[PDB]
Design an enzyme around this catalytic site. Structure first.
Site, PDB file in Angstrom:
ATOM      1  N   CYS A  47       0.746  -1.147   0.130  1.00 23.58           N
ATOM      2  CA  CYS A  47      -0.032  -0.010  -0.079  1.00 23.58           C
ATOM      3  C   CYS A  47       0.987   1.229   0.018  1.00 23.58           C
ATOM      4  CB  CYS A  47      -0.886   0.006   1.186  1.00 23.58           C
ATOM      5  SG  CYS A  47      -1.683   1.572   1.422  1.00 23.58           S
ATOM      6  N   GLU A  70      -4.840   3.225 -10.674  1.00 21.82           N
ATOM      7  CA  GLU A  70      -5.729   2.199 -10.599  1.00 21.82           C
ATOM      8  C   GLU A  70      -6.906   2.046 -11.422  1.00 21.82           C
ATOM      9  OE1 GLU A  70      -6.128   3.197  -6.274  1.00 21.82           O
ATOM     10  OE2 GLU A  70      -6.349   0.884  -6.003  1.00 21.82           O
ATOM     11  N   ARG A  92      -0.188   4.659   2.951  1.00 20.89           N
ATOM     12  CA  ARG A  92      -0.102   4.249   4.430  1.00 20.89           C
ATOM     13  C   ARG A  92       0.371   5.529   5.349  1.00 20.89           C
ATOM     14  NH1 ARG A  92       4.120  -0.469   4.958  1.00 20.89           N
ATOM     15  NH2 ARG A  92       4.577   0.005   2.798  1.00 20.89           N
ATOM     16  N   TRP A 135      -9.447   6.231  -0.973  1.00 21.06           N
ATOM     17  CA  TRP A 135      -9.634   6.665  -2.233  1.00 21.06           C
ATOM     18  C   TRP A 135      -9.062   6.220  -3.152  1.00 21.06           C
ATOM     19  CZ3 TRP A 135      -8.308   9.998   2.271  1.00 21.06           C
ATOM     20  CH2 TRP A 135      -6.952  10.242   2.101  1.00 21.06           C
TER      21      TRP A 135
HETATM   22  C1  HEM Z   1      -6.229   6.413   1.536  1.00 18.66           C
HETATM   23  C2  HEM Z   1      -6.281   6.023   0.441  1.00 18.66           C
HETATM   24  C3  HEM Z   1      -5.647   4.728  -0.184  1.00 18.66           C
HETATM   25  C4  HEM Z   1      -4.854   4.771  -1.181  1.00 18.66           C
HETATM   26  C5  HEM Z   1      -4.691   5.687  -2.519  1.00 18.66           C
HETATM   27  C6  HEM Z   1      -4.292   3.534  -1.591  1.00 18.66           C
HETATM   28  C7  HEM Z   1      -3.585   2.946  -2.445  1.00 18.66           C
HETATM   29  C8  HEM Z   1      -3.168   1.554  -2.679  1.00 18.66           C
HETATM   30  C9  HEM Z   1      -2.940   1.051  -4.007  1.00 18.66           C
HETATM   31  C10 HEM Z   1      -2.507   1.893  -5.256  1.00 18.66           C
HETATM   32  C11 HEM Z   1      -2.712  -0.072  -3.878  1.00 18.66           C
HETATM   33  C12 HEM Z   1      -2.348  -1.280  -4.738  1.00 18.66           C
HETATM   34  C13 HEM Z   1      -3.647  -1.841  -5.327  1.00 18.66           C
HETATM   35  C14 HEM Z   1      -3.269  -2.520  -6.573  1.00 18.66           C
HETATM   36  O1  HEM Z   1      -2.211  -2.481  -7.270  1.00 18.66           O
HETATM   37  O2  HEM Z   1      -4.116  -3.518  -6.861  1.00 18.66           O
HETATM   38  C15 HEM Z   1      -2.912  -0.666  -2.387  1.00 18.66           C
HETATM   39  C16 HEM Z   1      -2.946  -1.658  -1.828  1.00 18.66           C
HETATM   40  C17 HEM Z   1      -3.652  -2.229  -0.690  1.00 18.66           C
HETATM   41  N1  HEM Z   1      -4.161  -1.130   0.086  1.00 18.66           N
HETATM   42 FE1  HEM Z   1      -4.118   0.574   0.275  1.00 18.66          FE
HETATM   43  N2  HEM Z   1      -4.687   2.721  -0.384  1.00 18.66           N
HETATM   44  C18 HEM Z   1      -5.473   3.530   0.445  1.00 18.66           C
HETATM   45  C19 HEM Z   1      -5.903   3.140   1.618  1.00 18.66           C
HETATM   46  C20 HEM Z   1      -5.941   1.938   2.261  1.00 18.66           C
HETATM   47  C21 HEM Z   1      -6.831   1.399   3.400  1.00 18.66           C
HETATM   48  C22 HEM Z   1      -7.697   2.378   4.360  1.00 18.66           C
HETATM   49  C23 HEM Z   1      -6.257   0.369   3.787  1.00 18.66           C
HETATM   50  C24 HEM Z   1      -6.912  -0.588   4.763  1.00 18.66           C
HETATM   51  C25 HEM Z   1      -7.020  -0.214   6.014  1.00 18.66           C
HETATM   52  C26 HEM Z   1      -5.481  -0.125   2.755  1.00 18.66           C
HETATM   53  C27 HEM Z   1      -4.715  -1.562   2.546  1.00 18.66           C
HETATM   54  C28 HEM Z   1      -4.281  -1.815   1.363  1.00 18.66           C
HETATM   55  C29 HEM Z   1      -3.949  -3.352   1.064  1.00 18.66           C
HETATM   56  C30 HEM Z   1      -4.110  -4.420   1.924  1.00 18.66           C
HETATM   57  C31 HEM Z   1      -3.610  -3.446  -0.101  1.00 18.66           C
HETATM   58  C32 HEM Z   1      -2.817  -4.747  -0.841  1.00 18.66           C
HETATM   59  C33 HEM Z   1      -4.181  -5.423  -1.379  1.00 18.66           C
HETATM   60  C34 HEM Z   1      -3.817  -6.684  -2.185  1.00 18.66           C
HETATM   61  O3  HEM Z   1      -2.862  -7.290  -1.916  1.00 18.66           O
HETATM   62  O4  HEM Z   1      -4.439  -7.118  -3.252  1.00 18.66           O
HETATM   63  N3  HEM Z   1      -5.193   0.779   1.843  1.00 18.66           N
HETATM   64  N4  HEM Z   1      -3.414   0.715  -1.760  1.00 18.66           N
HETATM   65  N1  LIG Z   2      -7.173   3.245  -3.694  1.00 20.17           N
HETATM   66  C1  LIG Z   2      -7.184   1.960  -2.826  1.00 20.17           C
HETATM   67  C2  LIG Z   2      -7.325   1.974  -1.508  1.00 20.17           C
HETATM   68  C3  LIG Z   2      -7.587   0.998  -0.877  1.00 20.17           C
HETATM   69  C4  LIG Z   2      -6.920  -0.343  -1.525  1.00 20.17           C
HETATM   70  C5  LIG Z   2      -7.004  -1.493  -0.951  1.00 20.17           C
HETATM   71  C6  LIG Z   2      -6.725  -2.751  -1.339  1.00 20.17           C
HETATM   72  C7  LIG Z   2      -6.448  -2.713  -2.753  1.00 20.17           C
HETATM   73  C8  LIG Z   2      -6.465  -1.525  -3.431  1.00 20.17           C
HETATM   74  C9  LIG Z   2      -6.831  -0.262  -2.809  1.00 20.17           C
HETATM   75  N2  LIG Z   2      -6.715   0.775  -3.555  1.00 20.17           N
HETATM   76 CL   LIG Z   3     -10.113  -1.382  -8.207  1.00 14.03          CL
END
Ligand code: HEM
Ligand SMILES: Nc1ccc2ccccc2n1
Ligand SMILES: [Cl-]
Ligand code: HEM
Ligand SMILES: Nc1ccc2ccccc2n1
Ligand SMILES: [Cl-]
Lengths: 362, 362
Positions: free
Chosen positions: A65, A242, A68, A237
């Protein structure tokens, strides 16, 4: 073997959690209460404070992520009190509403009762609470191919999609005891969608592209100190890439690059013209512009990488070891324009964290 | 310990090499001759056939290389006969000339005498045979910053650069026995350069950008069956992104994105405008167009990835295990538009191969 593991993980969690909360002295007594609870009942119940912080730590430890930086402001909704499918459904409806927040998206997690003996109380089938259906029948490709298996599963249960390219999948989850899941159609009033237009190319709207406002991942397991919250949907958000570089661009998704090249008026004949690259940029510009115009929260990959740099700096300052997955952290367009590309990351797993689970369909 | 290692590695190499050449029966006798040679002399001498194929295998095993499809057509120049610095210099001059081939670049390696007791016969200081100098003095940043340390080293030896942004570094190498390396100025007639113009943006030439035709990496060690060829410069043709997305784009290199945005007439004020991304695409289009117009070989990242897919398929067909470094194989622009992005690669080291060495400067 079972109660031992739960006890060990709980020891590690409570110590670290209470340390971070400046509750270091309350550990021994809390650890005592927990050990008695494990002996007698086989499990322990988190306080609201432990659960809230555990969910926040889990986001902080999500190696893949980029967003973070804002781990500590996660809006945690404690719904361990739900017992009925009407309660689950309304909780999911509620999550969508409050996280959406009229466009000013609140990063939010709704936490349902955890696994008991490894027995799930609630099992959510949706990959995301809001996701488009996908169909394939006799050459005809419709909607989101990534949703093909879940869509067929839903239609096996009496749901029927209109077969547009953007059918909203129903919420679908199974309660403990029931052989089959139930499904509920999504109220359109709850779901914000964004029509994709380009800031200066008027013909872009001819593609009739759109995407939903809020990504709410609902098939991952939150693990906090030995407790397995298999059902705990969470959202942030979007980062524009993505949508513009993956969801709408991938050949195995919406596959729109050739059509994008057409409406922006460039040839799609020669690799050396870099037409896919140009189409990707204009499409990703369109996505950012569209969400901004409608007042729906979104972040570009450059700004997101800057924020992540601050997360790295913040981590170092707090004495915390930093973990990350380089292959997921780099954005899918211009990754070398970000600092992420030019350094390495330790991809070690730290708990609390979010984990993959097997799909009940498939 | 020393002669043992040499023998083991030689066993593994000769067996595999002769198998591939359909010379499987000639192994035992050749292995015999080698073992006697090791006993008596402490090392062994490759045949021209073993050396040529060993250099080709090494390219095939280069995990970080996207252009491995053409491993078997590598032009190998055997220069283990050189003894004088005039011979080395002329060999390097010759490599530049024949590899360049008036623009139709021939992938070529020139192999110099290998390490004896770990004692180097020839030590090349250049990172690439053709590379631009870099300077930093009193706020003033000139040329290629990546060349700053070697440039200072050269100037410590009596060389002086004109201090343009594109000073050609002299060839600089040290012979066994000498305390200092010697340097020779590059004949301009040997070096092809390409002025960067844009296919439809006339103002692009105002940037006065250019790059050299042939990337000839000259500081890596070729290892073939226990023999260490520390001095064996090799070249292919450029992939456009190496120049447009890295050499000219990186902040720690030529850092030209802001100037590119200006000449293509877009604002460089807001991250959400994706101006760096757009500048990267137009600059990379310019690079490809420029090399093509001048008749200098180059490959775009899409075509290169397609060729690499065929390398993967060819490897599977030949029964060969495939190795690769995902983090290097993906192109720095639109990597998700390539198949490479969507699969994983085993990053195991297989010999023969090319390896990093410590810089004698620094
Ligand atoms: C605040 C806005 C957020 C943005 C912009 C963001 C951005 C991202 C992005 C771009 C990815 C990659 C997804 C992909 O390539 O398929 C990701 C993965 C991830 N995010 Fe975030 N994220 C956010 C919030 C969060 C929140 C709130 C959580 C959980 C509490 C979180 C947990 C994760 C997890 C677990 C992954 C990995 C999912 C997987 O392995 O398939 N994120 N995030
Ligand atoms: N933009 C965004 C926020 C949270 C995510 C969690 C897991 C996968 C992708 C995500 N994208
Ligand atoms: Cl998506
Ligand atoms: C035929 C044209 C070739 C192309 C287009 C090509 C392409 C590339 C590219 C783009 C890289 C990544 C460089 C970087 O990101 O810094 C690379 C790395 C590499 N290539 Fe190739 N290559 C070619 C030929 C060769 C040849 C002839 C050899 C040697 C026999 C070779 C060996 C390598 C090695 C060793 C690396 C890794 C260098 C390092 O680790 O720094 N390649 N190649
Ligand atoms: N284009 C190209 C060819 C050969 C290389 C060898 C090592 C690094 C980079 C290279 N690029
Ligand atoms: Cl280079």
């Amino acid at each position: 073997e079972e109660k031992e593991i739960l006890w060990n993980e709980a020891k590690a969690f409570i110590a670290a959690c209470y340390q971070e909360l400046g509750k270091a002295a309350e550990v021994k007594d809390r650890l005592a209460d927990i050990k008695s609870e494990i002996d007698l009942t086989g499990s322990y119940v988190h306080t609201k404070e432990e659960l809230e912080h555990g969910a926040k730590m889990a986001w902080r430890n999500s190696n893949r992520c980029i967003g973070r930086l804002f781990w500590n402001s996660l809006n945690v909704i404690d719904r361990r009190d739900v017992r009925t499918k009407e309660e689950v459904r309304d909780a999911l409806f509620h999550h969508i509403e409050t996280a959406t927040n009229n466009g000013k998206i609140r990063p939010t997690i709704t936490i349902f009762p955890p696994e008991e003996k490894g027995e799930k109380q609630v099992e959510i089938w949706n990959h995301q609470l809001i996701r488009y259906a996908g169909y394939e029948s006799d050459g005809e490709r419709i909607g989101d191919p990534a949703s093909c298996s879940l869509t067929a599963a839903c239609e096996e249960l009496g749901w029927r999609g209109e077969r547009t390219d953007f059918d909203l999948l129903p919420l679908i989850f199974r309660m403990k005891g029931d052989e089959q899941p139930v499904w509920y159609e999504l109220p359109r009033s709850l779901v914000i969608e964004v029509p994709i237009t380009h800031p200066d190319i008027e013909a872009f709207s001819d593609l009739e592209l759109k995407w939903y406002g809020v990504p709410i991942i609902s098939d991952m397991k939150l693990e906090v100190g030995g407790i397995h919250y298999n059902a705990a949907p969470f959202n942030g958000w979007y980062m524009g890439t993505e949508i513009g570089a993956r969801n709408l661009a991938d050949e195995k998704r919406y596959d729109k690059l050739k059509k994008v090249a057409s409406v922006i008026g460039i040839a799609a004949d020669y690799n050396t013209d870099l037409w896919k690259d140009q189409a990707l940029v204009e499409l990703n510009k369109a996505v950012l512009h569209s969400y901004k115009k409608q007042g729906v929260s979104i972040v570009d990959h450059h700004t997101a990488a800057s924020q992540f740099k601050r997360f790295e700096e913040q981590a170092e300052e707090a004495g915390r070891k930093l973990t990350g997955d380089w292959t997921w952290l780099i954005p899918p367009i211009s990754p070398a324009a970000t600092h992420i590309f030019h350094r390495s990351y330790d991809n070690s797993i730290v708990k609390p964290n979010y984990f993959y689970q097997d799909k009940p369909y498939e």
